[PDB]
Amino acid sequence: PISPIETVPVKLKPGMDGPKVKQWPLTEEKIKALVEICTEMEKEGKISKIGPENPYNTPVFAIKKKDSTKWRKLVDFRELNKRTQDFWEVQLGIPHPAGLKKKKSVTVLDVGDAYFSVPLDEDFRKYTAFTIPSINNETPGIRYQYNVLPQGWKGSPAIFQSSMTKILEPFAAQNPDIVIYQYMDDLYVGSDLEIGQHRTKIEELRQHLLRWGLTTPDKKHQKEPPFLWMGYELHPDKWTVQPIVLPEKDSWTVNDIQKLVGKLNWASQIYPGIKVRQLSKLLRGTKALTEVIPLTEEAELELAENREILKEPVHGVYYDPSKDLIAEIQKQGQGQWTYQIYQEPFKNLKTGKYARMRGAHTNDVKQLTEAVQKITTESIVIWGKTPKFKLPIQKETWETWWTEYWQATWIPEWEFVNTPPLVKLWYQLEKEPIVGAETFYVDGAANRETKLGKAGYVTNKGRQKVVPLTNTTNQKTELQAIYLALQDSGLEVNIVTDSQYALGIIQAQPDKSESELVNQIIEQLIKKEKVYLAWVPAHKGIGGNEQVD
């Protein structure tokens, strides 16, 4: 009938004193409600009545509908939380259903209320002092302080989780035939034991927890499978996530949005394609921290877009550690890519999408590489290993690319899968000057003030041209010059430029750009048979006719 636990030493941030927020007026009704609740709590040892000597205070609320029960006591620890030391991160990552191995028997227990049975560090209790105002300011308010982890306090989640882990350690270690996982408030217990035996282990686990004064809600009778674990519906052979309905309203509060983004973040590793535009509002919304009403705009488009994706259910299989992980990727267009990770064909563990990183100039090979890295890291998180890739790029194209690219790059074990559209190199510059090919010496210049400029070329075969330009810069004209040489030359051409800027764009080997001019150059290079781009320092005895532009 006795019960013991160890407390975690807690401290306020260095240089800070406890909270001293004054208690505001409360109606006679709410006061009587609070007095009752507190009497009950004090009877269970959750709180203790203190004297007038404690200088700390945190305001208390009273709310709720009589439906479920009478009133509910709510203590706002905002100030104490700001003064409380930081704790180790409880989160850090969310378990993915496809990371689970198949188990014959599974049970999920709810330990969401057990935190209120964990004792609070004795020397920290005095900082949780609160006061219940008296009937009509005629008597000193009743003073209380917590003896257990408070509902909204900063250290409750982390202290509770570490306490639970310590209690479960001996049970798990002495029952290696069962697997125990704890996410926030759900306790997953799975095994390959016959149902009779599995139920026996569950009973023993609950009695084990009971020795520390930690109870688990009564038998929530229902048909299984499916087994519900942190939003996933677990079946013996597959798992499922039911469609996620997002709230429909025309007015949003900071709190509404935080819960929405929290739900989307969770669904992000489950569903392909999500959003982060509403975050911008949150950084400025929760920036003020105020739980007011942020006017939603444009986040409207992603919300309507997330809503559509979440309209569908997600199905997948479990992981078989005795088989290889395979990841296959497909180019969809517009810088979007899709991928499926599986072990057996058509039995996906995880499917998703990858959007290209924002940038001025890009290339399909660079994007495929990024997608591979992203998928690699995610796979290591979930399965602890890198999958074998099936990529829509020829082994020969890859070789040409990485051997010539100025940066170091690499892709892990992979095989070519012929699935259009295939990724390729659209153009390839020459390493040496082309014999017999006309040589174009190009140059450009603009007037900063007038914004007027010229771009032209002179060639070894006497060909020459100058074109006027308006509303341009030096860099603009440098690129126009190269573009002109490409337009007026044959299939093979040597181009000499003094533009380090242009050379820098082209050496990046873009096959697509946001800049109209660069895209035009790209289209031209694609049509050429051979192009050699040579650089020379400007303002010297080179080129010959740079006086024309």
Binding site: residue ranges?
110, 185-186, 443, 478, 498, 549
Alpha carbons 524 and 200: distance in angstroms, whole number: 74
Closest separation in Å from C-beta 544 to another protein: 5
Q: Tokens representing 448?
A: 């900063």
* Residue 125 contacts Mg ion per CB under 5 A: no
255 versus 428: smaller Cβ distance to another protein:
428
Binding segment toward another protein, per CB under 8 A, in 65-73, 304-312, 330-338, 436-444: 436-444
95 versus 225: smaller Cβ distance to another protein:
95
Element (DSSP H or E) covering residue 66: none
Among 24, 435, 448, 547, binds another protein (CB under 8 A): 435
Q: Which does 226 bind (CB under 5 to 8 A by kind): Mg ion, another protein, none?
A: Mg ion
Among 56, 130, 383, 483, binds another protein (CB under 8 A): 383
Closest separation in Å from C-beta 532 to another protein: 7
405 versus 501: smaller Cβ distance to Mg ion:
501
Q: Report helix, strand or coil for 339.
A: strand
Closest separation in Å from C-beta 135 to another protein: 41
Other beta carbons less than 10 A from residue 534's beta carbon: 14
Closest separation in Å from C-beta 182 to another protein: 7
Closest separation in Å from C-beta 108 to Mg ion: 13
Instruction: Show contacts with another protein in window 50-89 (CB under 8 A).
Output: 85-88
Alpha carbons 526 and 425: distance in angstroms, whole number: 9
Among 382, 446, 469, 521, binds another protein (CB under 8 A): 382
* Residue 324 contacts another protein per CB under 8 A: no
Alpha carbons 57 and 72: distance in angstroms, whole number: 19
Tell me, what DSSP letter sits at residue 410?
A: -
Among 140, 243, 433, 490, binds another protein (CB under 8 A): 433
* Residue 290 contacts another protein per CB under 8 A: no
Beta strands at 388-391 and 414-416: parallel, antiparallel or unpaired: parallel
Closest separation in Å from C-beta 5 to another protein: 13
Give the distance from CA 461 to its chain's centroid: 58
Runs of H (alpha helix) within 457-531 = 474-487, 500-506, 516-527
* Residue 191 contacts another protein per CB under 8 A: no
216 versus 242: smaller Cβ distance to Mg ion:
242
Residue type at 98 in one-letter notation: A
Instruction: Show contacts with Mg ion in window 207-226 (CB under 5 A).
Output: 226
Distance, first Cα to last Cα, the chain:
96
Q: Which does 352 bind (CB under 5 to 8 A by kind): Mg ion, another protein, none?
A: Mg ion
* Residue 228 contacts another protein per CB under 8 A: no
Among 328, 378, 438, 478, binds Mg ion (CB under 5 A): 478
* Residue 378 contacts Mg ion per CB under 5 A: no
Instruction: Show contacts with another protein in window 148-187 (CB under 8 A).
Output: 155, 158-159, 161-162, 165, 181-183
* Residue 283 contacts another protein per CB under 8 A: no
Q: How many residues bind Mg ion, per CB under 5 A?
A: 9
* Residue 470 contacts another protein per CB under 8 A: no
Beta strands at 186-191 and 105-110: parallel, antiparallel or unpaired: antiparallel
Query: CB-based contacts of 153: which residues, under 8 Å, 6+ apart?
Result: 77, 80, 81, 84, 128
Residue with tokens 């639970």: 164
Closest separation in Å from C-beta 395 to another protein: 11
Of 411, 408, 403, 409, nearest to 428 (Cα)? 403
**Cα–Cα–Cα angle for 399, 405, 406, rounded to 5 degrees:** 150
Distances (CA, A) of 237 to 95, 183, 225, 226, 356: 18, 22, 10, 10, 35
Binding segment toward another protein, per CB under 8 A, in 220-228, 250-258, 276-284, 407-415: 407-415
Q: Tokens representing 438?
A: 């006309």
* Residue 443 contacts Mg ion per CB under 5 A: yes
Tell me, what DSSP letter sits at residue 99?
A: G
Residue type at 340 in one-letter notation: Q
Among 304, 504, 527, 529, binds another protein (CB under 8 A): 504
Q: Are 212 and 160 in contact (CB under 8 A)?
A: no
* Residue 262 contacts another protein per CB under 8 A: no
Alpha carbons 365 and 392: distance in angstroms, whole number: 10
Q: What is the CA radius of gyration of the chain?
A: 33
Element (DSSP H or E) covering residue 156: helix 156-173
Burial 312-341 (b: 16+ CB within 10 A, else e): eebebbbbeeeeebbbbbbbeeebebbbbb
Q: Report helix, strand or coil for 535.
A: strand
* Residue 97 contacts Mg ion per CB under 5 A: no
Binding segment toward another protein, per CB under 8 A, in 34-42, 202-210, 300-308, 427-435: 427-435
* Residue 352 contacts Mg ion per CB under 5 A: yes
Tell me, what DSSP letter sits at residue 276?
A: -
Closest separation in Å from C-beta 538 to Mg ion: 6
144 versus 337: smaller Cβ distance to another protein:
337
* Residue 549 contacts Mg ion per CB under 5 A: no
* Residue 417 contacts another protein per CB under 8 A: no
Of 84, 76, 87, nearest to 16 (Cα)? 84
Q: Which does 233 bind (CB under 5 to 8 A by kind): Mg ion, another protein, none?
A: Mg ion
* Residue 233 contacts Mg ion per CB under 5 A: yes
Residues that bind Mg ion (CB under 5 A): 226, 233, 240, 350, 352, 443-444, 478, 499
